[PDB]
Amino acid sequence: RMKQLEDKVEELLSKAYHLENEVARLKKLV
Amino acid sequence: RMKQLEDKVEELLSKAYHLENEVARLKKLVG
Amino acid sequence: RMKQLEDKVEELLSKAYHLENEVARLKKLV
């Protein structure tokens, strides 16, 4: 339910971390 | 109270997809 | 349990927003 939801928030965390490790790559390189 | 929470986890779910998408485009157009 | 899930979820809604801008400024500088 919530182990399913702290799992949702689990997936979104993983994702925003990669999304910054990249938006911050581009940013440098571009 | 689940309405709200299980609806914002939609707003962000959406947006993780757009952005994943968008970043990827940029990455491609900048090699 | 819930608050936590709404702690999480709120923060993420503000990282989320900061990144959306980021990808437009980027979008333009290209």
UniProtKB/Swiss-Prot annotation, chains A, C:
Positions of region (Leucine-zipper): 5-26
Domain of life: Eukaryota
Compartments in which it is found: Nucleus
Post-translation changes: Phosphorylated by the cyclin-CDK PCL5-PHO85.
Gene induction: Translation is induced by amino acid or purine starvation, or during growth in low or poor carbon sources. Translational repression during nutrient-rich conditions is dependent on four uORFs (upstream open reading frames) present in the 5'-UTR of the mRNA; these promote ribosome dissociation. Translational induction occurs in conditions reducing translation machinery efficiency, leading to ribosomes scanning over the uORFs, and increased translation of the mRNA. The rapid translational induction is followed by transcriptional induction at later time-points, independently of the uORF sequences.
Deletion phenotype: Abolishes recruitment of the mediator complex to the upstream activating sequence (UAS) of amino-acid starvation responsive genes. Decreases RNA level of genes involved in amino acid biosynthesis and cofactor biosynthesis during amino acid starvation or methyl methanesulfonate stress. Growth dependent on amino acid supplementation. Sensitive to amino acid starvation. Sensitive to purine starvation. Decreases cellular glycogen levels during glucose starvation.
Free-text note regarding domains: Residues 89 to 100 and 106 to 125 define the N-terminal activation domain (NTAD) and the central acidic activation domain (CAAD) respectively, which can function independently to promote high-level transcription of the target genes.
Job description of the protein: Master transcriptional regulator that mediates the response to amino acid starvation. Binds variations of the DNA sequence 5'-ATGA[CG]TCAT-3' in canonical nucleosome-depleted 5'-positioned promoters, and also within coding sequences and 3' non-coding regions. During nutrient starvation (low or poor amino acid, carbon or purine sources), it activates genes required for amino acid biosynthesis and transport, autophagy, cofactor biosynthesis and transport, mitochondrial transport, and additional downstream transcription factors.
Quaternary assembly: Homodimer. Each subunit binds overlapping and non-identical half-sites that flank the central CG base-pair in the pseudo-palindromic motif 5'-ATGA[CG]TCAT-3'. Interacts with the mediator tail; the interaction with GAL11/MED15 is direct. Interacts with the SAGA histone acetyltransferase complex. Interacts with the SWI/SNF chromatin remodeling complex.
Stated family: Belongs to the bZIP family. GCN4 subfamily.
Protein name, per record: General control transcription factor GCN4
Residues of the full protein shown: 249 to 278 of 281
Curated annotation (Swiss-Prot), chain B:
Gene null: resulting phenotype: Abolishes recruitment of the mediator complex to the upstream activating sequence (UAS) of amino-acid starvation responsive genes. Decreases RNA level of genes involved in amino acid biosynthesis and cofactor biosynthesis during amino acid starvation or methyl methanesulfonate stress. Growth dependent on amino acid supplementation. Sensitive to amino acid starvation. Sensitive to purine starvation. Decreases cellular glycogen levels during glucose starvation.
Localisation: Nucleus
Cleavable signal peptide: none
Leucine-zipper: region residues: 5-26
Coiled-coil boundaries: none
Induction record: Translation is induced by amino acid or purine starvation, or during growth in low or poor carbon sources. Translational repression during nutrient-rich conditions is dependent on four uORFs (upstream open reading frames) present in the 5'-UTR of the mRNA; these promote ribosome dissociation. Translational induction occurs in conditions reducing translation machinery efficiency, leading to ribosomes scanning over the uORFs, and increased translation of the mRNA. The rapid translational induction is followed by transcriptional induction at later time-points, independently of the uORF sequences.
Domain of life: Eukaryota
PTMs per UniProt: Phosphorylated by the cyclin-CDK PCL5-PHO85.
Record text about domains: Residues 89 to 100 and 106 to 125 define the N-terminal activation domain (NTAD) and the central acidic activation domain (CAAD) respectively, which can function independently to promote high-level transcription of the target genes.
Protein family per UniProt: Belongs to the bZIP family. GCN4 subfamily.
Function summary: Master transcriptional regulator that mediates the response to amino acid starvation. Binds variations of the DNA sequence 5'-ATGA[CG]TCAT-3' in canonical nucleosome-depleted 5'-positioned promoters, and also within coding sequences and 3' non-coding regions. During nutrient starvation (low or poor amino acid, carbon or purine sources), it activates genes required for amino acid biosynthesis and transport, autophagy, cofactor biosynthesis and transport, mitochondrial transport, and additional downstream transcription factors.
Quaternary state and interactors: Homodimer. Each subunit binds overlapping and non-identical half-sites that flank the central CG base-pair in the pseudo-palindromic motif 5'-ATGA[CG]TCAT-3'. Interacts with the mediator tail; the interaction with GAL11/MED15 is direct. Interacts with the SAGA histone acetyltransferase complex. Interacts with the SWI/SNF chromatin remodeling complex.
Protein's name according to its UniProt entry: General control transcription factor GCN4
Organism lineage string: Eukaryota, Fungi, Dikarya, Ascomycota, Saccharomycotina
Parent sequence residues shown: 249 to 279 of 281
